[PDB]
Amino acid sequence: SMGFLILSRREGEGITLSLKADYPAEELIRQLREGGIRILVTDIIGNQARVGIEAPRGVLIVRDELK
Amino acid sequence: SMGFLILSRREGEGITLSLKADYPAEELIRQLREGGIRILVTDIIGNQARVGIEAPRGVLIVRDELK
Numbered sequence A, B: 001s002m003g004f005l006i007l008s009r010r011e012g013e014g015i016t017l018s019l020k021a022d023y024p025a026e027e028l029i030r031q032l033r034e035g036g037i038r039i040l041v042t043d044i045i046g047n048q049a050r051v052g053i054e055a056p057r058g059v060l061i062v063r064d065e066l067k
Helices: A024-033 B023-034
Strands: A002-009 A012-021 A037-045 A048-056 A059-063 B003-010 B013-019 B037-045 B049-057 B057-061
Touching: A002 A012, A002 A059, A012 A048, A012 B023, A024 A048, A024 A059, A024 B013, A024 B023, A037 B037, A037 B049, A048 A059, A048 B037, A048 B049, B003 B013, B003 B057, B013 B049, B023 B049, B023 B057, B049 B057
Parallel strands: none
Antiparallel strands: A002 A048, A012 A059, A012 B037, A037 A048, A037 B013, B003 B049, B013 B057, B037 B049
16 A cells, blocks of 8 residues: 655745665565656645655655755 | 756646666666655745656656646
């Protein structure tokens, strides 16, 4: 199954996607070749955009201001 | 160097990221572990959000309405 993260982002705010160190390379590459990552603009509430990300469990999703 | 794509997205519009079939698995996994993918909300022009994506060259970036 998939991890799902939707966050409000203002101008100049972002997200970094990386690979989790504890998951194996053969499997992550197969997660990403086969199904990929989906980015969705879910809502635009004025000066904010709610961005959804659906990604296999091996993908680390971190808001830029955290790391 | 990096591929860069910025597109206007309205509500319910998205992007799919996948891995290019012609690039080797060892290298792509190392592209993504080391540097990752950056998603940036660059501008919110009313009912549209301009979403930037910076990704290593091995990553295929496709607007949902194309494939």
